[PDB]
Amino acid sequence: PQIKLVLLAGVGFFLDAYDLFIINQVAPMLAQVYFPKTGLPAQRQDLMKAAANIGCVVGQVMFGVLGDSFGRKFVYGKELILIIVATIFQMSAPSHWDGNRVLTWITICRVFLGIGIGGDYPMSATVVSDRANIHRRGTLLCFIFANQGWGSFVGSLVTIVTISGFKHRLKSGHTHDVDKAWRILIGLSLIPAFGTLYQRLTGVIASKKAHWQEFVAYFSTWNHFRNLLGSMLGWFLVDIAFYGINLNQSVVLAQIGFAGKTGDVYDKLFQLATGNIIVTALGFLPGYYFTLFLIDIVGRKKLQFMGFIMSGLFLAILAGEIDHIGKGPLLACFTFMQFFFNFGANTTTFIVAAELFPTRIRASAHGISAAAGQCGAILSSLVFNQLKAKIGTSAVLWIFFSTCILGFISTFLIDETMGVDPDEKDLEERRAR
């Protein structure tokens, strides 16, 4: 039936999400092995974490050219093998290498990893927005998008299980086995990857200038231009804080009381992994499902309004009080923020970008909107840890705060897509004129 296809897209989203966010759990282990006395260099850590998002836009543009040039049967399988190979090379960095060399190994591997993740990422949204043509199209988009929380959650769940497995061996003095652990965290993504592989198995310039002429003609009108504008900004703006935080969630929990002064090698890693599962289970994951139950009742905008404006509130409380109040109050607000990321802008911007546009231009407008989002992701990802040392963490959170207010303001540019058919709206727009 039609069901088996959306699950395959879901596990595609899950694997992308797992592979994307698992770098947040892997980074602290690399520190203990190759840089035990000093932290990971700021510039090198930023490059490593942005690498996946950098490839993510390269993927959907390259797999866009190749997919438009030679069809869909030329990209469907090849996207999955690229992230599999990138996982293996990343997994098998020579353990006898220098710290900087190991880092440079992993950064490069994750770029190719991003290129594959970029393929099935916008392609999983169109298959179910074009197919449904029903009021319950948003809940379908949200369900596949909800796998992003499971990717972050399962990665967090995998981490505590892995760390607790090395407990006795670490306590008995075998401290280098953490070098084995971080390879296991990355490798475990291979299990659904191979399973999906089997199930997936078992006049070009004249047309590009004609669709460009229609695209330019369409988005040269205000009521049509602004819909692409708000779609581009909202996805761009939410991804700044969203990926800057979620790819650095372990860094924030280090300013909070989860990075102490007590404990040995195991005690340190386990307390940090404890906070990560708390936040992603209590906040990050359920946010997708609150969005799931209310988009076709409340509307995309009101949820986007709330999502942008609520997560901002908790960002200001952090920035003002992070250096002044205790761990408890800070942790609670951090979880609330993560909750309203997925219960709000992060999920709706993905939905709104696929729901706003008539099909005749939707591929570009969603592609540009998704590309716009990844642009915000790479911005924060590339500079997050560098700013943290130059201006301080409180100052950086004030920046993420400002991006949320602008997202709230920009959301006014969007038409509410709940229950509206963008193709029927375009047809009625034309028949009246």
**Residue 332 Cβ vs ligand BNG, minimum distance, rounded to whole Å:** 35
Compute, in degrees rounded to 10, the torsion defined by CA atoms 427, 364, 239, 153: 90
Q: How many CB atoms lie within 10 A of CB 221?
A: 11
Of residues 33, 57, 109, 318, which one binds ligand BNG by CB under 6 A?
109
In contact, 292 and 143? CB cutoff 8 Å: yes
Q: How many CB atoms lie within 10 A of CB 320?
A: 14
**Residue 195 Cβ vs ligand BNG, minimum distance, rounded to whole Å:** 22
Which one, 22 or 253, has the nearer CB to ligand BNG? 22
Of residues 412, 427, 428, 429, which one binds ligand BNG by CB under 6 A?
412
| Binding status of residue 108 toward ligand BNG by CB under 6 A | yes
Note the Cα 288 to chain centre separation in Å.
Answer: 13
Stretch 342-371 residues interacting with ligand BNG (CB under 6 A): none
| Binding status of residue 19 toward ligand BNG by CB under 6 A | no
Percentage helix, strand, coil for the chain under 3-state DSSP, each rounded to 5: 85, 0, 15
Short-list 245, 209, 203, CA closest to 69: 203
Which one, 10 or 119, has the nearer CB to ligand BNG? 119
In contact, 414 and 299? CB cutoff 8 Å: no
Which phi and psi angles does 101 have, rounded to 5°? -70, -40
CA-to-CA distance for 247 and 114, rounded, in angstroms?
A: 14
Stretch 112-171 residues interacting with ligand BNG (CB under 6 A): 112
Stretch 38-97 residues interacting with ligand BNG (CB under 6 A): 85-86, 89
Q: How many residues bind ligand BNG (CB under 6 A)?
A: 12
**Residue 104 Cβ vs ligand BNG, minimum distance, rounded to whole Å:** 5
The angle at the Cα of 365, spanning 362 to 371, to the nearest 5 degrees, equals 130
The angle at the Cα of 348, spanning 346 to 351, to the nearest 5 degrees, equals 115
CA-to-CA distance for 210 and 230, rounded, in angstroms?
A: 25
Tokens of 301: 């905008």
Q: Can you say whether the dihedral through the CA atoms of 167, 168, 172, 178 is positive or negative?
A: negative
**Residue 93 Cβ vs ligand BNG, minimum distance, rounded to whole Å:** 9
Which one, 332 or 406, has the nearer CB to ligand BNG? 406
**Residue 33 Cβ vs ligand BNG, minimum distance, rounded to whole Å:** 17
CA-to-CA distance for 6 and 382, rounded, in angstroms?
A: 33
Which one, 26 or 277, has the nearer CB to ligand BNG? 26
**Residue 231 Cβ vs ligand BNG, minimum distance, rounded to whole Å:** 12
**Residue 171 Cβ vs ligand BNG, minimum distance, rounded to whole Å:** 34
Note the Cα 70 to chain centre separation in Å.
Answer: 29
In the block, tokens 């959170």 appear at 397
Of residues 66, 281, 298, 413, which one binds ligand BNG by CB under 6 A?
413
| Binding status of residue 101 toward ligand BNG by CB under 6 A | yes
Of residues 8, 35, 84, 104, which one binds ligand BNG by CB under 6 A?
104
In contact, 115 and 55? CB cutoff 8 Å: yes
| Binding status of residue 418 toward ligand BNG by CB under 6 A | no
The residue range among 17-25, 31-39, 378-386, 409-417 that interacts with ligand BNG, by the rule CB under 6 A, is 409-417
Which one, 194 or 412, has the nearer CB to ligand BNG? 412
Which one, 89 or 289, has the nearer CB to ligand BNG? 89
Of residues 41, 58, 66, 105, which one binds ligand BNG by CB under 6 A?
105
Tokens of 269: 């890693």
Which one, 70 or 412, has the nearer CB to ligand BNG? 412
**Residue 88 Cβ vs ligand BNG, minimum distance, rounded to whole Å:** 8
**Residue 297 Cβ vs ligand BNG, minimum distance, rounded to whole Å:** 19
Compute, in degrees rounded to 10, the torsion defined by CA atoms 166, 167, 170, 173: -140
The residue range among 67-75, 107-115, 150-158, 423-431 that interacts with ligand BNG, by the rule CB under 6 A, is 107-115
Of residues 319, 415, 418, 422, which one binds ligand BNG by CB under 6 A?
415
| Binding status of residue 270 toward ligand BNG by CB under 6 A | no
Q: Amino acid identity of 399?
A: I
Which one, 49 or 388, has the nearer CB to ligand BNG? 49
- Burial environment of residue 428 by CB neighbours within 10 A (0 to 12, 13 to 18, 19 or more): exposed
Short-list 31, 188, 47, 27, CA closest to 111: 47
Where along the sequence are the contacts to ligand BNG (CB under 6 A)?
85-86, 89, 101, 104-105, 108-109, 112, 412-413, 415
